[PDB]
Design an enzyme around this catalytic site. Structure first.
Site, short mmCIF file in Angstrom:
data_model
loop_
_atom_site.label_atom_id
_atom_site.label_comp_id
_atom_site.label_asym_id
_atom_site.label_seq_id
_atom_site.Cartn_x
_atom_site.Cartn_y
_atom_site.Cartn_z
N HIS A 460 0.76 -1.30 -0.09
CA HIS A 460 0.10 0.07 -0.15
C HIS A 460 0.81 1.29 0.02
CE1 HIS A 460 -3.97 -2.02 1.57
NE2 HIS A 460 -3.32 -2.47 0.82
N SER A 497 -7.81 1.12 5.99
CA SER A 497 -6.95 -0.06 5.68
C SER A 497 -6.64 -0.22 4.14
CB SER A 497 -8.01 -1.15 6.16
OG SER A 497 -9.17 -0.95 5.49
C1 LIG Z 1 -0.68 -6.95 -4.52
C2 LIG Z 1 -1.32 -5.56 -4.34
C3 LIG Z 1 -2.65 -5.79 -3.62
C4 LIG Z 1 -3.28 -4.81 -3.53
N1 LIG Z 1 -4.78 -4.96 -2.94
C5 LIG Z 1 -5.54 -3.93 -2.57
C6 LIG Z 1 -6.64 -4.02 -2.10
O1 LIG Z 1 -7.18 -5.28 -1.84
N2 LIG Z 1 -7.48 -2.91 -1.63
C7 LIG Z 1 -6.94 -1.86 -1.89
O2 LIG Z 1 -7.83 -0.81 -1.48
N3 LIG Z 1 -5.93 -1.36 -2.43
C8 LIG Z 1 -5.14 -2.69 -2.73
N4 LIG Z 1 -3.51 -2.48 -3.23
C9 LIG Z 1 -2.95 -0.93 -3.34
C10 LIG Z 1 -3.83 -0.02 -4.52
O3 LIG Z 1 -4.37 -1.00 -5.42
C11 LIG Z 1 -2.79 0.89 -4.91
O4 LIG Z 1 -2.25 1.83 -3.72
C12 LIG Z 1 -3.40 1.93 -5.89
O5 LIG Z 1 -3.55 1.27 -7.39
C13 LIG Z 1 -2.85 3.22 -6.04
O6 LIG Z 1 -2.31 3.43 -7.28
P1 LIG Z 1 -2.23 4.68 -8.13
O7 LIG Z 1 -3.43 5.02 -8.57
O8 LIG Z 1 -1.31 5.61 -7.40
O9 LIG Z 1 -1.09 4.12 -9.43
P2 LIG Z 1 -1.43 2.81 -10.12
O10 LIG Z 1 -2.78 2.03 -10.15
O11 LIG Z 1 -0.36 1.82 -10.17
O12 LIG Z 1 -1.20 3.46 -11.72
C14 LIG Z 1 0.40 3.53 -12.11
C15 LIG Z 1 -0.07 3.14 -13.73
O13 LIG Z 1 1.10 4.09 -14.46
C16 LIG Z 1 1.84 3.23 -15.24
N5 LIG Z 1 3.08 3.97 -15.45
C17 LIG Z 1 3.92 4.14 -14.57
N6 LIG Z 1 5.06 4.55 -15.15
C18 LIG Z 1 4.89 5.21 -16.28
C19 LIG Z 1 5.47 5.71 -17.30
N7 LIG Z 1 6.64 6.36 -16.78
N8 LIG Z 1 4.68 5.94 -18.69
C20 LIG Z 1 3.56 5.28 -18.91
N9 LIG Z 1 2.93 4.90 -17.73
C21 LIG Z 1 3.50 4.69 -16.55
C22 LIG Z 1 1.72 1.85 -14.68
O14 LIG Z 1 2.13 1.19 -15.77
C23 LIG Z 1 0.63 1.77 -13.96
O15 LIG Z 1 -0.43 1.20 -14.96
C24 LIG Z 1 -2.76 -3.54 -3.36
C25 LIG Z 1 -1.57 -3.38 -3.89
C26 LIG Z 1 -0.88 -4.24 -4.32
C27 LIG Z 1 0.51 -4.10 -5.05
#
Ligand SMILES: Cc1cc2nc3c(=O)[nH]c(=O)nc-3n(C[C@H](O)[C@H](O)[C@H](O)COP(=O)(O)OP(=O)(O)OC[C@H]3O[C@@H](n4cnc5c(N)ncnc54)[C@H](O)[C@@H]3O)c2cc1C
Length: 521
Positions: A460, A497
């Site tokens: 997370h 959480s």
């Molecule tokens: C195994 C696992 C299980 C989880 N389970 C839960 C859960 O059950 N419940 C919950 O609430 N949260 C869960 N989480 C956490 C939650 O899903 C993340 O914290 C949430 O996705 C926040 O991500 P974000 O929007 O900041 O970025 P992300 O969703 O990771 O998006 C970033 C995207 O940008 C892309 N990217 C990165 N760099 C570049 C680049 N330079 N050029 C183009 N594209 C790029 C990547 O490919 C990625 O697809 C889990 C996380 C993991 C790792």
């Protein structure tokens, strides 16, 4: 909440590969990263303006195992090779971890547990919040990708243990992160289909939105004038090698939504960062932003694995044991014949041969932070180093001991008695896989040791580009026009959480803010 159905791919009419994208083109908004936060923000911005999301990974269609919950373990167990939806990294600390690399982001590979943020977050945060909008935004997401879970043998068995253990009140089924045991929403429907944020692109406007995949964004371009720095566009590489340009129009902006690891990285590689550090690597400095890559947080995960003498059903997590200083839940699963990366903190961890259950604890905040460092010249495709400094702040560790003590009680309750191997009392009798609890439940100095050796990631992580440090209340990179960050990296403490609820929301939120300031101007 939504009704169970198939995953909605109608957005493919306007999703392209990046080799099929024009070599240069103009848009009103460019969004780097088509993840948890990007997708809703793309959808939102497209209602009224021309938009292009750019994404390094693939369509979810390419990897059918993340459309279901059965596949959850599988995605983790597959080798990392640059193409697959799960990117394996290890921290400076030495703790195995993953992040998504797929359209829909990490919401496409995650455990799918839904929760609305702790209301008391919204006021002590640095941004001032419109709460009619926030709440109405949750509605919009939920009404689309969030479902009310059906009773599951093992999970209801955990609800009872939590309520026997002291985790009161019984909130029943509720989406709100509050204290007590509850049954929360999930992004897995009642057939076990994964619904993630790619599906929120369908909430967009087909005539205005253009998704692009296998578009690795390399650089944010800026303009000298007038008179100050503005984003003008980005450069991305297609799978052949061809670099493309995407530019913003008059009045438009570029928005980075590449997550805690992606955003700090793209910004740093584009020369927005701590001056002395960029010079050090010979990266031309475009604005001296000392806090980029700073304050990276990751909540420690501490757990107990039990191997019951009789088999138990695999479950999707839906039952939560929320207390003020830590949060708990329990996962049951089929055995592991090949290790799923990041589930355990190192690859040499014993694998379970039968079904097993996993009791976890997540400290809130946390208070301990670290740093993003680049190590490859520029190559965006080279995962930066992260250090999280687990249990560096003594309060995180206190809450760990607490939380582990409380798992000790979960194991003592009447509900867990049929899962002991022999009729010994207290925590004894369980067949433990990996590191067991301290014997004496009053031995602080021993539980502290447990917490420090057993620690893994809750996955997370968040931080690296904080509001009131790099961004203002509107999510703008201060002193740079037309550049915004929206995603996991934007706040120092965990919202609940389980964070995806907050981030999914945070995407369409900032969307409406931008859309609003486009009508009031
Ligand atoms: C195994 C696992 C299980 C989880 N389970 C839960 C859960 O059950 N419940 C919950 O609430 N949260 C869960 N989480 C956490 C939650 O899903 C993340 O914290 C949430 O996705 C926040 O991500 P974000 O929007 O900041 O970025 P992300 O969703 O990771 O998006 C970033 C995207 O940008 C892309 N990217 C990165 N760099 C570049 C680049 N330079 N050029 C183009 N594209 C790029 C990547 O490919 C990625 O697809 C889990 C996380 C993991 C790792």
């Amino acid at each position: 909440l939504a009704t169970t159905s198939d995953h909605d791919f109608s957005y493919l009419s306007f999703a392209y590969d990046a080799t099929d994208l024009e070599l240069e083109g103009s848009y009103d908004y460019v969004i780097v990263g088509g993840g948890t936060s990007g997708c809703p923000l793309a959808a939102t911005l497209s209602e009224k303006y021309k938009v292009l999301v750019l994404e390094r990974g693939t369509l979810p269609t390419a990897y059918p195992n993340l459309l279901t919950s059965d596949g959850f373990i599988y995605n983790l167990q597959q080798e990392d090779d640059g193409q697959t939806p799960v990117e394996r990294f290890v921290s400076g600390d030495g703790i195995d971890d993953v992040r998504g690399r797929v359209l829909g982001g990490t919401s496409m590979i995650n455990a799918g547990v839904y929760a609305r943020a702790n209301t008391k977050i919204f006021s002590a945060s640095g941004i001032e919040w419109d709460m009619d909008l926030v709440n109405q935004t949750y509605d919009w997401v939920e009404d689309t990708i969030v479902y009310k879970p059906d009773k599951q043998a093992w999970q209801s068995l955990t609800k009872t243990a939590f309520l026997e253990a002291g985790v009161l009140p019984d909130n029943g089924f509720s989406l709100d992160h509050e204290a007590g045991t509850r049954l929360t929403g999930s992004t897995f429907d009642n057939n076990g289909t994964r619904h993630a944020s790619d599906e929120l692109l369908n909430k967009g406007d087909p005539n205005n939105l253009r998704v692009a995949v296998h578009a690795s964004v390399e650089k944010i371009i800026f303009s000298s004038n007038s008179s100050g720095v503005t984003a003008i566009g980005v450069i991305y590489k297609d799978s052949n090698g061809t670099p493309h340009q995407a530019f913003v129009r008059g009045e438009g902006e570029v928005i980075v939504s590449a997550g805690p690891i992606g955003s700090p990285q793209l910004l740093l590689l584009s020369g927005v960062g701590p001056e002395s550090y960029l010079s050090s690597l010979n990266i031309p400095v475009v604005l001296s932003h000392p806090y980029v890559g700073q304050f990276l947080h990751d909540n420690p995960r501490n757990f107990i694995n039990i191997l019951p003498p009789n088999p138990i059903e695999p479950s999707t997590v839906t039952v939560l044991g929320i207390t003020s200083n830590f949060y708990q839940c329990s996962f049951s699963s089929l055995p592991f014949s090949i290790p799923p990366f990041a589930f355990f903190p190192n690859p040499t961890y014993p694998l379970p041969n039968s079904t097993f259950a996993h009791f976890v604890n997540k400290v809130p905040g946390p208070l301990s932070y670290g740093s993003i460092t680049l190590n490859s010249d520029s190559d965006v495709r080279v995962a930066p180093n992260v250090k999280f400094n687990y249990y560096s702040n003594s309060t995180d560790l206190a809450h760990c001991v607490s939380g582990m003590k409380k798992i000790g009680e979960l194991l003592s309750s009447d509900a867990l008695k049929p899962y002991k191997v022999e009729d010994l009392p207290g925590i004894d009798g369980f067949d433990i896989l990996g590191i067991p609890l301290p014997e004496n439940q009053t031995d602080d100095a021993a539980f502290e040791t447990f917490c420090r050796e057993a620690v893994a990631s809750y996955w997370h992580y968040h931080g690296g580009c904080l509001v009131g440090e790099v961004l203002d209340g509107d999510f703008r990179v201060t002193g740079i026009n037309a550049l915004r960050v929206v995603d996991g990296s934007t706040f120092p403490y965990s919202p609940a959480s389980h964070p995806q609820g907050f981030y999914l929301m945070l995407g369409r939120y900032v969307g409406s803010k931008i859309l609003q300031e486009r009508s009031a101007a």
